[PDB]
Symmetry: D2
Subunit: 508 residues, 4 copies
């Protein structure tokens, strides 16, 4: 009746008039350019998996309308069993990219999956949500989350650097402005414009809507591409992760883009723009998605580290095994947070369920200390062994250097130099490369800075009265005694021997 | 057939147990200041078992069905049961505000599975079946004495009589032992591989030959030199980590669980199922304790007025983050269990093995934040309660020790001393040391997780995961058909640096 | 002349001082268990000043030249002096094993500079010049009472030190100070302020008050030494029973402060500058850094003995963390070395210890010392609980033989030795005494935020931060959007553009 | 008089028959290839500074022979004043490379500067040391420290895997035929000669007990490079987009010897298995190398601190209290390594022939606190600047392109009132220092610069155990225990309070 996109169909959808810029040049074909080519084929694997009959039970589910099937995470869960199956689907796609591609098409489904039960929240534009929910289910659409405001000067009415309406036509809304760190945007179908907060509180800034990536006026200015650089100066062997998994955090610029009314979710309502960051249900599911994925990535890094320690022979050392288990401990933590999130949900709109908020609010903090610790352990237990490597694959083919490398760069496993160098460069690409550096910064500030993640945690529990409960808990301990002694009947104060002991040092 | 009551439990301790403290033998354990109030606190747990308003949370039938019992003493057979297990554990944890770790329900992590795991203890399988029945019926209080003292130093058999087994040796850090009904003698690992050391059994605390040498009592010191106000936690919640010494104790055959079988003694620390439930219990309890400390810290910061500052609020939320962590680990443990013996379920091992590590870094961090955000405000206190009654000092304290909250000096000193007793006292120090090494030293906890994942092939799975990535390319480029290697522009760029 | 002896110092405490503890007034401070043994320890310090074998390290002339005094009570005029100052401080630190931080030589960080920095205290500059003289002659024991008591702010500020009346005889002052550590065993409390807090003439007061002054009261915190006397023993509580410094509340009730005791009054400006211009903070960090280095040696030796007994010393992982403690030990000796040997010029040819070395100490002590205590709790672990209640258990025939059988060390040590070190180590780490010292060394100079903030402010005001930014700016000046601006560097434009062309038509 | 090398002379000295490999090709001219071109020009700046009359007082000193002058650190100090001047000289050259080029020519001078007073230690080859000391002073030679053994398979017998180590294969009349390899030979491709040494002998055979110097143009010696971050920046980056990596990259290359003839005049130690193993602590290098690295790291932290300050000033996060605490934290670490360096220079230890070594314990501490301090500094940047580092464009051409240029200038301005160009300039410089391949390598570098995080602490424990300092600490602790026993105090001046203790015990009697 109705199927989602295939790998090729997704690729064809990117071959439009989108205006992507990189290294001063405009990218003619996004699916052909080295910066996006292999990443696009990687995303195509996700779409192709939806059509594999051996994976349909895990990955797919009916599309509410029932005319077809869709990616499971694009549908609202109505039971714990659904959320457990949601977890498997997320972990499935995560493994296909080895846990590195955070902005896979299923991530933004953390928002899209709630447009069905939470449509009325977007009044008067509630019907727009009702259709985009239907369609994003129908095609399994790829949206990017553009919400971060660009840096602004403080010197005068020039607040127009923000996304803003310049004109209200009958067709829709003429919009100019920009958003930063629009990760993966160049390979998406549409940019979802939102805000973490309005600096100027006027109607023209209060806009939440989706815009097609080929919209006239919309331009994409890329950050330096680690995948493109790996194509020209590196190799699949020397740069296994960066060359095919790099998600470009590009600048998204709108120049008088016409946003149709059918694409608007919120407009003018500064409250709903504010309430979106906590009542949309995205953050509960986004943390649910990210935690499950991070758990998968840790398995990959743990396996990488384990193979590395076997090759260097450091696996035999006791201290090294402690830190390896430490990496495994963090792996179990995020699997447990994901388990708690999926299996201990909270009731939401129209009989649907959101993953455990308290499991999600904790993930935002421990990711900022856990992931760097993992990267630190690698730098500590492998150390300079990561630098025991050659320039490129040409060094092994060159008769002048090849034999030397195989003689002096062997592993302890009985492994060859090729195997050792292969793991070391793979590990380094995950830890010390431009790609690894970006991902460390990524997993550290992915949801917010290290202060706000904890503060928003305090505020959330204060508002929910949980903080009041903790203080009442402590107060219950204090109510059981006073300056005279215990107030609880079943406890003895030992007034006699206490005063007797006090008198033992009397007159001194 | 109801379990023991609070008063009945107290009477059960008034036996011929040989407890020593400060060079003297303790005549009445339930009367001595070192154990009096802690025993009364333990009595509260037993009394809660009989409250009709708490029966739904705390209780369940006794397998035989002739009565009821504490829920954790029964083997879980569903996820719903394990969620209720969590509620029961959290309930008793709150009654002691999360400080009494070796409560009677903790050792039930072992006792609650002796029914479904009886045949593992052959030929003494019937011994497990009775101790399971009885521990259900009365809710018995056992202490886990397993830590070896630094050949005759180990628990060992000296003689095999027809009546039972003559045993000498010792155990250290027998926490709460003096107020328990029986010591469960076990081992984590055998230093000497001999039959006489391969012994797992329970011994009554009033058994002739068994002696208890106490650690310094923080509750006794608080009774004679302190007060319930100046020492709110230590004076009534102190669990003495005493030395447990056996001198030719006769262990009846009906009390032996494992003997001679060198395999089952070694295998016990991983096949008994205790470790999955003990971590489940401890994690649930620690989550409760963190709530208590969080509420304490919040009151402290509110009184000092430091709650308004942004930096302080970040670290307060950090404490709440750790609180959510152990609740999530407990949630994951209870709601994602693994199948076990006789249709029963063990809590998630993967959640419990993580708990043993993050507790060693999390709990000290919480105590550290208190020392950082309250700082010298913990020392803004007077010697004792008599200072408030003394006309010479009383009014002065009331003037100079008020809080920013608009609070009085009495309230401020009350919070500070409660917080300090939780963080910096001998009681706080012991508990810092406890929560750090309660399950093992900071090295073994991580290694045993690695060993557990290595044996299960999970570690092998991770390496296969990484290997799958390497199989998609080689020295030539990608081996996957759908990927481009860009050999042309790569070699073209190499030519830019030719000669 | 000469400073006080051990007996003379003890006799000086037997005055009309009003010390309170457990609701009762202490009749004789030198006799009460709370202060008895700690006072005898301080007496050791005074007695060391008269030992001919220690005169070269500890002593120096007294400016007037009519006698001698403790070396740190004189202003250093050379690097050699500051090195000898370090030796004097380290000497007294070892006598208390680095625990009694508020020893009489600590307050000399302020007192030792009243000579060269007397005119800063005008018009009361002459009061400073003789109190400099007098505190030098006897080696007076002053406590630094500067921390303001908690206030409600909901609206009178009578909790702060303030003048209630100005007589011709002196100044009538009421108020309080908190965490007056060691005050009960001191000769006089030196009242100062870090906070303003309110812009009023009458709160701007810096002066000294005798500890036996009528109206002055001392309200003690729970005494760890007194409790160890009644429920413990020197064996079971070796540090707390004799080294406990009571952080008491210091209360003034209409105390008449003579004009001869005033250092600063009314001058609201100098009170603010007092923290940065008294010179004390440079020397106080110098004193504390040297002492902490001494204490770490004590803990390191303690830990090593414990690990040898538990047998954990043979393990590689344990040795790494043992070496980690030694690393911190070397750190504070190096900070002290940099402080003593790289000083800064000050008033009248005198020198202050290196400020940059001392200000770093205020931060790394907050992370270093807890780490040391943590390693002990990790590598000794539950072995600290492998102990008996008290010494009576060894004497009891019913328990004695058992302890000696089951509580032996792996080194071949007896139970007595094992319990001895284990109780000594615990008293240093996990007891009320150990907890208080962790909290102390953590907040010794200020909370963990201000120590870093005051560091930023100090380098910003000195233009040092400006220097760092100019350094980075010098790098940016060597290139721009065109390429390098430096002549000797190549931009490789031809090759770069050629590589850019590799992605043409894509 | 005699002068050291100039910038041009140093560059010409590299234009020899050195066999350097990179990206499968042999480098024809090292001074011309992008991988080494700009790094060589930066090193050339150091040599040129020696001839600047405005810098001779700080940088230079007589050359023992007195026939000329030389870099001051190549001479042995005889006073505290000398080591303070040494500190200034090291800090001077460190600033010229902004504290990044760790293996500068003066680093290996930590060894060469001691060949004068410690010549007789290398008998019978003492005269070889005396002349290489003489010559290295005269031109300020650039040596690289190759000591790290290449990876070996411990599942094979040592008979098979000892050909991986540097070893003598034959003793000719001319010298010694040597084969083997060394790893992480940082900066080797731009050096004059490789100093072959060992961190102890792994196999105890005469053939491995070899300590000698080999010219970089020696026939048989090959250099296999690690991926060059400067070369990649030349083709895909720019001085604006990659300010540090493109000109400060030190390649940690593999150094391979294939039947290289080492002349007898170049041998320092041979056959003496004792001196080779004992050298790592008796050469005096470790005291000075830690002294050099500590002084340099202090300089680098100032550069990073200034960078962070500008970044926070631009983002406007500098006004926040929490951000200022961590900024001061970076300044705290900055003060730390200056203090460690001060203690090293101003509290030295006596050595051979009236010369002085910097404080060893100040240096032994440096080897540890660098492994926790520097990552913390880099962490603070990722925390306080955060995603603001990704607020950047692909390259400088985006500003030149009329289609994107104006947009960047409008939307990427700073809070400072700064333009977009300046902001992107600072962010890309900061990222190149923190998150780039160059930054990653440098994080790994400062982490294992002296050794892995375990050995650095253990060697400290062993050093203090051997010196009896560890026993001294235990005697300190013992002095406390000697003052009491099971009876009470043993010290006369202390009261045991036997009365009230037993009285209190009786209150809890029966
Ligand atoms: Ca503590
Ligand atoms: Ca990093």
């Amino acid at each position: 009746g109705t199927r989602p996109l295939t790998g090729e169909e997704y690729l064809e959808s990117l071959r439009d008039a989108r205006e992507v810029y990189l290294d001063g040049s405009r990218v003619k074909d996004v699916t052909a350019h080295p910066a996006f080519h292999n990443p696009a084929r990687m995303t195509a694997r996700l779409y192709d998996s939806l059509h594999d009959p051996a994976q349909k039970a895990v990955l797919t589910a009916p599309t509410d309308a029932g005319d077809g099937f869709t990616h499971r995470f694009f549908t609202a869960p109505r039971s714990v069993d659904d959320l457990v199956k949601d977890q498997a689907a997320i972990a499935s796609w995560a493994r296909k990219s080895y846990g590195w591609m955070g902005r896979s098409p299923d991530y933004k489904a953390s928002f899209l999956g709630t447009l069905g039960a939470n449509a009325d929240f977007y009044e008067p534009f509630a019907d727009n949500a009702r259709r985009w929910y239907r369609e994003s289910q129908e095609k399994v659409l790829y949206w990017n989350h553009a919400f971060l405001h660009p840096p602004v000067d403080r010197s005068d009415e020039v607040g127009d650097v923000f996304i803003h309406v310049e004109r209200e036509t009958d067709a829709g809304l003429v919009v100019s402005g920009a958003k930063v760190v629009a990760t993966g945007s160049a390979l998406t179908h549409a940019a979802f414009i939102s805000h973490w907060g309005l600096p100027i509180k006027d109607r023209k800034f209060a806009l939440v809507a989706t815009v097609p990536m080929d919209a006239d006026g919309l331009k994409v200015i890329c950050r330096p591409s680690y995948s493109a650089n790996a194509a020209t100066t590196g190799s699949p062997f020397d740069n296994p992760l960066s060359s095919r998994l790099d998600e470009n955090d590009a600048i998204l610029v709108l120049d008088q883009v016409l946003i149709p009314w059918e694409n608007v979710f919120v407009y003018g309502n500064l409250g709903k723009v504010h309430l979106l960051a906590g009542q949309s249900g995205m953050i509960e599911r986004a943390t649910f998605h990210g935690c499950t994925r991070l758990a998968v990535k840790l398995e990959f890094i743990a396996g990488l580290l384990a193979k590395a320690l076997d090759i260097t022979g450091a696996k035999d050392f006791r201290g090294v095994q402690t830190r390896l288990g430490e990496v495994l401990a963090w792996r179990n933590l995020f699997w447990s947070l994901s388990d708690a999130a999926a299996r201990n949900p909270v009731p939401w709109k129209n009989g649907t369920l959101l993953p455990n908020p308290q499991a999600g609010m904790a993930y935002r903090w421990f990711m900022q200390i856990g992931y760097p610790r993992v990267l630190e352990i690698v730098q500590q237990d492998v150390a300079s062994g990561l630098m025991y490597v050659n320039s490129s694959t040409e060094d092994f083919r060159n008769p002048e250097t090849g034999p030397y490398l195989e003689k002096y760069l062997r592993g302890s496993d009985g492994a060859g130099a090729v195997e050792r160098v292969k793991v070391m460069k793979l590990l380094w690409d995950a830890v010390g490369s431009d790609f690894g550096g970006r991902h460390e910064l990524y997993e550290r500030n992915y949801s917010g800075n290290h202060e706000n993640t904890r503060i928003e945690l305090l505020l959330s529990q204060t508002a929910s009265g949980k903080l009041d409960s903790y203080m009442d808990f402590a107060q219950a301990c204090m109510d059981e005694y006073d300056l005279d002694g215990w107030t609880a009947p079943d406890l003895e104060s030992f007034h006699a021997m206490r005063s007797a002991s006090r008198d033992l040092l009397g007159g001194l």
